[PDB]
Amino acid sequence: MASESNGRKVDYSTFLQEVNNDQVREARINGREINVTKKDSNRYTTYIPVQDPKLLDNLLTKNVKVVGEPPEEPLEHHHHHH
């Protein structure tokens, strides 16, 4: 069984610095939270205090892998809720 807590906690500011240093390998986006894998196989999770659309463009210029998957709410599909 794998636990999410194992990932080191990282401030958004720290993440930006790592991007500039081309240390990040992959960044998954899910709502306000981003899950990140470093080239060194170390895993961590970072929170975005304020949405930064510019960040996406930066990751592309660095040739960093980007994944998008907004949170899903299957409950909303139900008509009874409305």
Side-chain angles (χ1 to χ4, degrees):
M1 296 188 300
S3 67
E4 297 183 350
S5 68
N6 294 343
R8 298 184 189 178
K9 296 184 185 282
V10 183
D11 299 270
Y12 176 39
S13 68
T14 306
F15 176 89
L16 299 173
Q17 186 187 56
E18 296 184 350
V19 179
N20 296 305
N21 296 339
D22 189 30
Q23 298 299 304
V24 184
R25 185 182 70 81
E26 185 183 2
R28 294 184 188 198
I29 302 171
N30 191 66
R32 198 180 71 266
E33 299 183 350
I34 304 171
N35 300 134
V36 186
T37 302
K38 294 185 184 202
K39 299 191 295 86
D40 199 90
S41 198
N42 298 331
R43 297 184 188 69
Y44 71 88
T45 306
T46 182
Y47 302 90
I48 311 170
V50 184
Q51 295 176 342
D52 210 303
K54 187 183 186 193
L55 186 70
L56 302 176
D57 296 329
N58 194 51
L59 300 175
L60 299 174
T61 307
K62 295 185 184 302
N63 302 334
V64 183
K65 187 183 186 182
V66 184
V67 187
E69 279 203 85
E72 188 184 2
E73 280 191 321
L75 302 176
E76 187 184 2
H77 292 75
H78 292 91
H79 296 92
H80 185 265
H81 184 66
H82 185 66

Coordinates of all heavy atoms in Angstrom, one line a residue:
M1 N 0.9 -1.2 0.0 CA 0.0 0.0 0.0 C 0.9 1.2 0.0 O 1.8 1.4 0.8 CB -0.9 0.0 1.2 CG -1.8 -1.2 1.2 SD -3.0 -1.1 2.5 CE -1.9 -1.1 3.9
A2 N 0.6 2.2 -0.9 CA 1.3 3.4 -1.0 C 0.6 4.6 -0.3 O -0.6 4.6 -0.4 CB 1.6 3.8 -2.5
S3 N 1.3 5.5 0.4 CA 0.7 6.6 1.0 C 1.2 7.9 0.4 O 2.3 8.1 0.1 CB 1.1 6.6 2.5 OG 2.5 6.8 2.6
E4 N 0.2 8.8 0.2 CA 0.5 10.1 -0.3 C 1.4 11.0 0.6 O 2.2 11.8 0.2 CB -0.8 10.9 -0.6 CG -1.6 10.1 -1.7 CD -2.9 10.8 -2.1 OE1 -3.2 11.8 -1.4 OE2 -3.5 10.4 -3.1
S5 N 1.2 10.8 1.9 CA 1.9 11.6 2.9 C 3.4 11.4 2.8 O 4.1 12.3 3.2 CB 1.5 11.1 4.3 OG 1.9 9.8 4.6
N6 N 3.9 10.3 2.2 CA 5.3 10.1 2.1 C 6.0 11.2 1.3 O 7.2 11.5 1.5 CB 5.6 8.8 1.3 CG 5.1 7.6 2.2 OD1 4.9 7.7 3.4 ND2 4.9 6.4 1.6
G7 N 5.2 11.9 0.4 CA 5.8 13.0 -0.4 C 6.1 14.2 0.5 O 5.3 14.6 1.3
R8 N 7.3 14.7 0.3 CA 7.8 15.8 1.1 C 6.8 17.0 0.8 O 6.3 17.2 -0.3 CB 9.2 16.2 0.7 CG 10.2 15.1 1.0 CD 11.6 15.5 0.7 NE 12.5 14.4 0.9 CZ 13.8 14.4 0.6 NH1 14.4 15.5 0.3 NH2 14.5 13.3 0.8
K9 N 6.6 17.9 1.8 CA 5.8 19.1 1.7 C 6.7 20.2 1.0 O 7.8 20.4 1.4 CB 5.3 19.6 3.0 CG 4.3 18.5 3.6 CD 3.7 19.0 4.8 CE 2.8 17.9 5.5 NZ 1.5 17.8 4.7
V10 N 6.2 20.9 0.0 CA 6.9 21.9 -0.7 C 6.0 23.2 -0.9 O 4.9 23.1 -1.3 CB 7.4 21.4 -2.0 CG1 8.3 22.5 -2.7 CG2 8.3 20.2 -1.8
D11 N 6.6 24.3 -0.6 CA 6.0 25.6 -0.8 C 6.0 25.9 -2.3 O 7.0 25.6 -3.0 CB 6.7 26.7 0.0 CG 6.6 26.4 1.5 OD1 5.6 26.8 2.1 OD2 7.4 25.7 2.0
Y12 N 5.0 26.6 -2.8 CA 4.9 27.0 -4.2 C 6.2 27.8 -4.6 O 6.7 27.6 -5.7 CB 3.7 27.9 -4.4 CG 3.6 28.5 -5.9 CD1 3.9 27.6 -7.0 CD2 3.2 29.8 -6.1 CE1 3.8 28.2 -8.3 CE2 3.1 30.3 -7.4 CZ 3.4 29.5 -8.5 OH 3.3 30.0 -9.8
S13 N 6.7 28.6 -3.7 CA 7.9 29.4 -4.0 C 9.1 28.4 -4.3 O 9.8 28.6 -5.3 CB 8.3 30.3 -2.9 OG 8.7 29.5 -1.8
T14 N 9.2 27.4 -3.5 CA 10.3 26.4 -3.7 C 10.2 25.7 -5.1 O 11.2 25.5 -5.8 CB 10.3 25.4 -2.6 OG1 10.4 26.1 -1.3 CG2 11.6 24.5 -2.7
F15 N 9.0 25.4 -5.4 CA 8.7 24.7 -6.7 C 9.2 25.5 -7.9 O 9.9 25.0 -8.8 CB 7.2 24.4 -6.8 CG 6.9 23.7 -8.2 CD1 6.9 22.3 -8.3 CD2 6.5 24.6 -9.3 CE1 6.6 21.8 -9.6 CE2 6.2 24.0 -10.5 CZ 6.2 22.6 -10.6
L16 N 8.9 26.8 -7.8 CA 9.3 27.7 -8.9 C 10.8 27.7 -9.1 O 11.3 27.7 -10.2 CB 8.8 29.1 -8.7 CG 7.3 29.1 -8.6 CD1 6.8 30.5 -8.2 CD2 6.7 28.8 -10.0
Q17 N 11.6 27.7 -8.0 CA 13.0 27.7 -8.1 C 13.5 26.5 -8.7 O 14.4 26.5 -9.6 CB 13.6 27.9 -6.7 CG 15.1 28.0 -6.8 CD 15.8 28.0 -5.4 OE1 15.6 27.0 -4.6 NE2 16.5 28.9 -5.0
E18 N 12.9 25.3 -8.4 CA 13.4 24.0 -8.9 C 13.1 24.0 -10.4 O 13.9 23.4 -11.2 CB 12.6 22.9 -8.2 CG 13.0 22.9 -6.7 CD 12.3 21.7 -6.0 OE1 11.5 21.0 -6.6 OE2 12.7 21.5 -4.9
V19 N 12.0 24.5 -10.9 CA 11.7 24.6 -12.3 C 12.8 25.4 -13.0 O 13.3 24.9 -14.0 CB 10.4 25.3 -12.5 CG1 10.0 25.4 -14.0 CG2 9.3 24.5 -11.8
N20 N 13.2 26.5 -12.5 CA 14.3 27.3 -13.1 C 15.6 26.5 -13.2 O 16.4 26.7 -14.1 CB 14.5 28.6 -12.2 CG 13.2 29.5 -12.3 OD1 12.8 29.8 -13.4 ND2 12.7 29.8 -11.2
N21 N 15.8 25.6 -12.2 CA 17.0 24.8 -12.2 C 16.9 23.5 -13.0 O 17.8 22.7 -12.9 CB 17.4 24.4 -10.7 CG 17.7 25.7 -9.9 OD1 18.0 26.7 -10.5 ND2 17.6 25.7 -8.6
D22 N 15.8 23.4 -13.8 CA 15.6 22.2 -14.6 C 15.8 20.9 -13.8 O 16.3 19.9 -14.3 CB 16.6 22.2 -15.8 CG 16.3 21.1 -16.7 OD1 15.1 20.7 -16.9 OD2 17.2 20.6 -17.4
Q23 N 15.4 20.9 -12.5 CA 15.4 19.7 -11.7 C 14.1 18.9 -11.7 O 14.1 17.7 -11.4 CB 15.7 20.1 -10.2 CG 17.1 20.8 -10.1 CD 18.2 19.8 -10.6 OE1 18.3 18.7 -10.0 NE2 19.0 20.2 -11.6
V24 N 13.0 19.6 -12.1 CA 11.7 18.9 -12.2 C 11.6 18.0 -13.4 O 12.0 18.5 -14.5 CB 10.6 19.9 -12.1 CG1 9.2 19.2 -12.0 CG2 10.7 20.7 -10.8
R25 N 11.0 16.8 -13.3 CA 10.8 15.9 -14.4 C 9.4 16.0 -14.9 O 9.1 16.2 -16.1 CB 11.2 14.5 -14.0 CG 11.1 13.6 -15.2 CD 11.4 12.1 -14.7 NE 10.3 11.6 -13.9 CZ 9.2 11.1 -14.4 NH1 9.0 11.1 -15.7 NH2 8.2 10.7 -13.7
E26 N 8.5 15.8 -14.0 CA 7.1 15.8 -14.3 C 6.2 16.5 -13.3 O 6.5 16.5 -12.1 CB 6.6 14.3 -14.3 CG 5.2 14.2 -14.8 CD 4.7 12.7 -14.7 OE1 5.4 11.9 -14.3 OE2 3.5 12.5 -15.1
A27 N 5.2 17.2 -13.8 CA 4.2 17.9 -12.9 C 2.8 17.6 -13.3 O 2.3 17.9 -14.4 CB 4.5 19.4 -13.0
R28 N 2.1 16.9 -12.4 CA 0.6 16.7 -12.6 C -0.2 17.8 -11.9 O 0.1 18.1 -10.8 CB 0.3 15.3 -12.0 CG 1.0 14.2 -12.7 CD 0.6 12.8 -12.1 NE 1.4 11.8 -12.7 CZ 1.0 10.5 -12.7 NH1 -0.1 10.1 -12.1 NH2 1.8 9.6 -13.2
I29 N -1.2 18.2 -12.6 CA -2.1 19.3 -12.1 C -3.5 18.7 -11.8 O -4.1 18.1 -12.6 CB -2.2 20.4 -13.1 CG1 -0.8 21.0 -13.5 CG2 -3.1 21.5 -12.6 CD1 -0.9 21.9 -14.7
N30 N -3.9 19.0 -10.5 CA -5.2 18.6 -10.1 C -5.8 19.7 -9.2 O -5.5 19.7 -8.0 CB -5.2 17.2 -9.3 CG -6.6 16.7 -9.1 OD1 -7.3 16.3 -10.1 ND2 -7.0 16.6 -7.9
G31 N -6.7 20.5 -9.7 CA -7.2 21.6 -9.0 C -6.1 22.5 -8.5 O -5.3 23.0 -9.2
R32 N -6.2 22.9 -7.2 CA -5.2 23.7 -6.6 C -3.8 23.0 -6.3 O -2.8 23.7 -6.0 CB -5.7 24.4 -5.3 CG -4.9 25.6 -4.9 CD -5.4 26.2 -3.6 NE -5.1 25.3 -2.5 CZ -6.0 24.4 -2.0 NH1 -7.2 24.2 -2.6 NH2 -5.7 23.7 -1.0
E33 N -3.9 21.7 -6.3 CA -2.7 20.9 -5.9 C -1.9 20.4 -7.1 O -2.5 20.0 -8.1 CB -3.1 19.7 -5.0 CG -3.8 20.3 -3.7 CD -4.2 19.2 -2.7 OE1 -4.1 18.0 -3.1 OE2 -4.6 19.5 -1.6
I34 N -0.6 20.4 -7.0 CA 0.2 19.8 -8.0 C 1.1 18.7 -7.4 O 1.7 18.9 -6.4 CB 1.1 20.8 -8.7 CG1 0.3 22.0 -9.2 CG2 1.9 20.2 -9.8 CD1 1.2 23.1 -9.6
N35 N 1.1 17.5 -8.0 CA 2.0 16.4 -7.6 C 3.2 16.4 -8.5 O 3.1 16.3 -9.7 CB 1.2 15.1 -7.6 CG 0.0 15.1 -6.7 OD1 -1.1 14.7 -7.2 ND2 0.1 15.6 -5.5
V36 N 4.4 16.3 -7.9 CA 5.6 16.5 -8.7 C 6.6 15.4 -8.5 O 6.8 14.9 -7.3 CB 6.3 17.9 -8.3 CG1 7.5 18.1 -9.2 CG2 5.3 19.0 -8.4
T37 N 7.2 15.0 -9.5 CA 8.3 14.0 -9.5 C 9.6 14.7 -9.9 O 9.7 15.3 -11.0 CB 8.0 12.8 -10.4 OG1 6.8 12.2 -9.9 CG2 9.1 11.8 -10.3
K38 N 10.7 14.6 -9.1 CA 12.0 15.1 -9.5 C 12.8 14.0 -10.3 O 12.5 12.8 -10.2 CB 12.8 15.4 -8.3 CG 12.1 16.6 -7.5 CD 13.0 17.0 -6.3 CE 12.4 18.1 -5.5 NZ 13.4 18.9 -4.7
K39 N 13.7 14.5 -11.1 CA 14.5 13.6 -11.9 C 15.2 12.5 -11.0 O 15.5 11.4 -11.4 CB 15.6 14.3 -12.6 CG 15.0 15.3 -13.6 CD 16.0 15.9 -14.6 CE 17.0 16.7 -13.8 NZ 18.1 15.9 -13.2
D40 N 15.5 12.9 -9.7 CA 16.2 12.0 -8.8 C 15.2 10.9 -8.2 O 15.5 10.3 -7.2 CB 16.9 12.8 -7.7 CG 17.9 11.9 -7.0 OD1 19.1 11.9 -7.5 OD2 17.6 11.3 -6.1
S41 N 14.0 10.8 -8.7 CA 13.0 9.8 -8.2 C 12.4 10.2 -6.9 O 11.5 9.5 -6.4 CB 13.7 8.4 -8.0 OG 12.6 7.4 -7.9
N42 N 12.8 11.3 -6.3 CA 12.2 11.8 -5.1 C 10.8 12.4 -5.4 O 10.7 13.1 -6.4 CB 13.1 12.9 -4.4 CG 14.4 12.3 -4.0 OD1 14.5 11.1 -3.7 ND2 15.5 13.0 -4.0
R43 N 9.8 12.1 -4.6 CA 8.5 12.6 -4.8 C 8.1 13.7 -3.8 O 8.4 13.6 -2.6 CB 7.5 11.5 -4.8 CG 7.8 10.5 -5.9 CD 6.8 9.4 -6.0 NE 7.2 8.3 -6.9 CZ 8.2 7.5 -6.7 NH1 8.9 7.6 -5.6 NH2 8.5 6.6 -7.6
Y44 N 7.3 14.7 -4.2 CA 6.8 15.7 -3.3 C 5.5 16.3 -3.8 O 5.1 16.1 -4.9 CB 7.8 16.8 -3.0 CG 8.0 17.7 -4.2 CD1 7.3 18.8 -4.4 CD2 9.1 17.4 -5.2 CE1 7.5 19.7 -5.5 CE2 9.3 18.2 -6.2 CZ 8.5 19.4 -6.4 OH 8.7 20.2 -7.4
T45 N 4.8 17.0 -2.9 CA 3.5 17.6 -3.2 C 3.6 19.1 -2.9 O 4.1 19.5 -1.8 CB 2.4 17.0 -2.4 OG1 2.4 15.6 -2.7 CG2 1.0 17.6 -2.9
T46 N 3.1 19.9 -3.8 CA 3.1 21.4 -3.6 C 1.7 22.0 -3.8 O 1.0 21.6 -4.6 CB 4.1 22.0 -4.6 OG1 4.2 23.4 -4.3 CG2 3.7 21.8 -6.0
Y47 N 1.4 23.0 -2.9 CA 0.2 23.7 -3.0 C 0.3 25.1 -3.7 O 1.3 25.7 -3.4 CB -0.4 23.9 -1.6 CG -0.6 22.6 -0.9 CD1 0.4 22.1 -0.1 CD2 -1.8 21.9 -1.0 CE1 0.2 20.9 0.6 CE2 -2.0 20.7 -0.3 CZ -1.0 20.2 0.5 OH -1.1 19.0 1.2
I48 N -0.6 25.5 -4.5 CA -0.5 26.7 -5.2 C -1.4 27.8 -4.5 O -2.6 27.7 -4.6 CB -1.1 26.6 -6.7 CG1 -0.5 25.4 -7.4 CG2 -0.7 27.9 -7.4 CD1 -1.2 25.2 -8.7
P49 N -0.8 28.7 -3.8 CA -1.6 29.8 -3.0 C -2.5 30.5 -4.0 O -3.7 30.8 -3.6 CB -0.5 30.7 -2.4 CG 0.8 30.3 -3.0 CD 0.7 28.9 -3.5
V50 N -2.0 30.9 -5.1 CA -2.8 31.6 -6.1 C -2.5 31.0 -7.5 O -1.4 30.7 -7.9 CB -2.6 33.1 -6.1 CG1 -3.5 33.8 -7.1 CG2 -2.8 33.6 -4.7
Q51 N -3.6 30.7 -8.3 CA -3.4 30.1 -9.6 C -2.5 31.0 -10.5 O -2.7 32.2 -10.6 CB -4.8 30.0 -10.3 CG -5.7 29.0 -9.5 CD -7.0 28.9 -10.1 OE1 -7.5 29.8 -10.9 NE2 -7.8 27.9 -9.8
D52 N -1.5 30.3 -11.1 CA -0.5 31.0 -11.9 C -0.6 30.4 -13.3 O 0.2 29.5 -13.6 CB 0.9 30.8 -11.3 CG 1.8 32.0 -11.6 OD1 1.9 32.3 -12.8 OD2 2.3 32.6 -10.7
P53 N -1.4 31.0 -14.2 CA -1.5 30.4 -15.6 C -0.1 30.5 -16.3 O 0.2 29.7 -17.2 CB -2.5 31.4 -16.3 CG -3.3 31.9 -15.2 CD -2.3 32.1 -14.0
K54 N 0.7 31.5 -16.0 CA 2.0 31.6 -16.6 C 2.9 30.4 -16.3 O 3.8 30.0 -17.1 CB 2.7 32.9 -16.0 CG 4.0 33.1 -16.8 CD 4.8 34.3 -16.2 CE 6.0 34.6 -17.1 NZ 6.9 35.6 -16.3
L55 N 2.7 29.7 -15.2 CA 3.6 28.6 -14.8 C 3.5 27.5 -15.9 O 4.5 26.9 -16.2 CB 3.1 28.0 -13.5 CG 4.0 26.9 -13.0 CD1 5.4 27.5 -12.6 CD2 3.4 26.1 -11.9
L56 N 2.3 27.3 -16.5 CA 2.2 26.3 -17.5 C 3.2 26.6 -18.7 O 3.9 25.7 -19.2 CB 0.8 26.3 -18.1 CG -0.2 26.0 -16.9 CD1 -1.7 26.1 -17.4 CD2 0.0 24.6 -16.3
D57 N 3.2 27.8 -19.1 CA 4.0 28.2 -20.3 C 5.5 27.9 -19.9 O 6.2 27.4 -20.8 CB 3.9 29.7 -20.6 CG 2.4 30.0 -21.0 OD1 1.8 29.1 -21.6 OD2 2.0 31.1 -20.8
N58 N 5.9 28.2 -18.7 CA 7.3 28.0 -18.3 C 7.7 26.5 -18.4 O 8.7 26.2 -19.1 CB 7.5 28.4 -16.9 CG 9.0 28.5 -16.6 OD1 9.7 29.2 -17.3 ND2 9.5 28.0 -15.5
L59 N 6.8 25.6 -17.9 CA 7.1 24.2 -17.9 C 7.2 23.7 -19.4 O 8.1 22.8 -19.6 CB 6.0 23.4 -17.2 CG 5.9 23.9 -15.8 CD1 4.6 23.2 -15.1 CD2 7.1 23.5 -15.0
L60 N 6.5 24.3 -20.3 CA 6.5 23.9 -21.7 C 7.9 24.3 -22.3 O 8.5 23.5 -23.0 CB 5.4 24.5 -22.5 CG 4.1 24.0 -22.0 CD1 2.9 24.7 -22.7 CD2 3.9 22.5 -22.2
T61 N 8.3 25.5 -22.0 CA 9.6 25.9 -22.6 C 10.8 25.1 -22.1 O 11.8 24.9 -22.8 CB 9.9 27.4 -22.1 OG1 8.7 28.2 -22.5 CG2 11.1 27.9 -22.8
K62 N 10.7 24.5 -20.8 CA 11.7 23.7 -20.3 C 11.6 22.2 -20.8 O 12.4 21.4 -20.4 CB 11.7 23.7 -18.8 CG 12.1 25.1 -18.3 CD 12.1 25.2 -16.8 CE 12.4 26.6 -16.3 NZ 13.7 27.1 -17.0
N63 N 10.6 21.9 -21.6 CA 10.4 20.5 -22.0 C 10.1 19.6 -20.8 O 10.6 18.5 -20.8 CB 11.6 20.0 -22.8 CG 11.8 20.9 -24.0 OD1 10.9 21.6 -24.5 ND2 13.0 21.0 -24.5
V64 N 9.3 20.1 -19.9 CA 8.9 19.3 -18.7 C 7.5 18.6 -19.0 O 6.7 19.3 -19.5 CB 8.8 20.1 -17.5 CG1 8.5 19.3 -16.2 CG2 10.2 20.8 -17.2
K65 N 7.4 17.4 -18.6 CA 6.1 16.7 -18.8 C 5.0 17.3 -18.0 O 5.1 17.6 -16.9 CB 6.3 15.2 -18.4 CG 5.0 14.4 -18.9 CD 5.1 13.0 -18.4 CE 4.0 12.2 -19.0 NZ 4.0 10.8 -18.5
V66 N 3.9 17.5 -18.7 CA 2.7 18.1 -18.1 C 1.5 17.3 -18.2 O 1.1 16.8 -19.3 CB 2.5 19.5 -18.7 CG1 1.4 20.3 -17.9 CG2 3.8 20.4 -18.6
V67 N 0.8 17.1 -17.1 CA -0.5 16.3 -17.1 C -1.6 17.2 -16.5 O -1.4 17.8 -15.5 CB -0.3 15.0 -16.3 CG1 -1.6 14.2 -16.5 CG2 0.9 14.2 -16.8
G68 N -2.8 17.2 -17.2 CA -3.9 17.9 -16.7 C -5.1 17.0 -16.4 O -5.5 16.2 -17.3
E69 N -5.6 17.0 -15.2 CA -6.8 16.2 -14.8 C -7.6 16.9 -13.7 O -7.4 16.6 -12.6 CB -6.4 14.8 -14.4 CG -6.1 14.0 -15.6 CD -6.2 12.5 -15.2 OE1 -7.3 12.0 -15.2 OE2 -5.2 11.9 -14.9
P70 N -8.5 17.8 -14.1 CA -9.4 18.5 -13.0 C -10.1 17.5 -12.2 O -10.5 16.4 -12.7 CB -10.3 19.4 -13.8 CG -9.7 19.6 -15.2 CD -8.9 18.3 -15.4
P71 N -10.4 17.8 -10.9 CA -11.2 16.9 -10.0 C -12.5 16.5 -10.6 O -13.2 17.3 -11.3 CB -11.4 17.6 -8.7 CG -10.3 18.6 -8.7 CD -10.0 19.0 -10.2
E72 N -12.9 15.2 -10.4 CA -14.2 14.7 -10.9 C -15.2 14.6 -9.8 O -14.9 14.2 -8.7 CB -14.0 13.4 -11.6 CG -15.3 13.0 -12.3 CD -15.1 11.6 -13.0 OE1 -14.1 10.9 -12.8 OE2 -16.1 11.1 -13.6
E73 N -16.5 14.9 -10.1 CA -17.5 14.8 -9.2 C -18.7 14.0 -9.7 O -19.7 14.5 -10.2 CB -18.0 16.2 -8.8 CG -17.1 16.8 -7.8 CD -17.7 18.1 -7.2 OE1 -18.3 18.8 -7.9 OE2 -17.5 18.3 -6.0
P74 N -18.6 12.7 -9.7 CA -19.6 11.8 -10.3 C -21.0 12.0 -9.7 O -22.0 11.7 -10.3 CB -19.1 10.3 -10.1 CG -18.1 10.5 -9.0 CD -17.5 11.8 -9.2
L75 N -21.0 12.5 -8.4 CA -22.3 12.7 -7.7 C -23.2 13.7 -8.5 O -24.4 13.6 -8.5 CB -22.0 13.2 -6.3 CG -21.2 12.2 -5.6 CD1 -20.8 12.7 -4.2 CD2 -21.9 10.9 -5.4
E76 N -22.5 14.8 -9.0 CA -23.3 15.8 -9.7 C -24.1 15.3 -10.9 O -25.2 15.8 -11.1 CB -22.3 16.8 -10.3 CG -23.0 18.0 -10.9 CD -22.1 19.0 -11.5 OE1 -20.9 18.8 -11.6 OE2 -22.6 20.1 -12.0
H77 N -23.6 14.2 -11.5 CA -24.4 13.6 -12.6 C -25.8 13.3 -12.2 O -26.7 13.4 -13.0 CB -23.7 12.3 -13.1 CG -22.3 12.6 -13.7 ND1 -21.2 13.0 -13.0 CD2 -21.9 12.6 -15.1 CE1 -20.2 13.1 -13.9 NE2 -20.6 13.0 -15.1
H78 N -26.0 12.8 -11.0 CA -27.3 12.4 -10.5 C -28.3 13.6 -10.7 O -28.0 14.8 -10.4 CB -27.3 12.0 -9.0 CG -26.5 10.7 -8.8 ND1 -25.2 10.7 -8.6 CD2 -26.9 9.4 -8.8 CE1 -24.8 9.4 -8.4 NE2 -25.8 8.6 -8.6
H79 N -29.5 13.3 -11.0 CA -30.6 14.3 -11.2 C -31.2 14.7 -9.8 O -31.7 15.8 -9.6 CB -31.6 13.8 -12.2 CG -31.1 13.6 -13.6 ND1 -30.6 12.4 -14.0 CD2 -31.0 14.5 -14.6 CE1 -30.3 12.6 -15.3 NE2 -30.5 13.8 -15.7
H80 N -31.3 13.7 -8.9 CA -31.9 13.9 -7.6 C -31.3 15.1 -6.9 O -32.0 15.9 -6.2 CB -31.8 12.7 -6.8 CG -32.5 12.8 -5.5 ND1 -31.9 13.1 -4.3 CD2 -33.8 12.5 -5.1 CE1 -32.8 13.1 -3.3 NE2 -34.0 12.8 -3.7
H81 N -30.0 15.2 -7.0 CA -29.2 16.3 -6.4 C -29.8 17.7 -6.8 O -29.8 18.6 -6.0 CB -27.8 16.2 -6.7 CG -26.9 17.3 -6.0 ND1 -26.7 17.2 -4.6 CD2 -26.2 18.4 -6.5 CE1 -25.9 18.3 -4.3 NE2 -25.6 19.0 -5.4
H82 N -30.3 17.8 -8.0 CA -30.8 19.1 -8.5 C -32.3 19.1 -8.1 O -33.0 18.1 -8.2 CB -30.6 19.2 -10.0 CG -31.1 20.5 -10.5 ND1 -30.5 21.7 -10.2 CD2 -32.1 20.9 -11.4 CE1 -31.1 22.7 -10.9 NE2 -32.1 22.2 -11.6

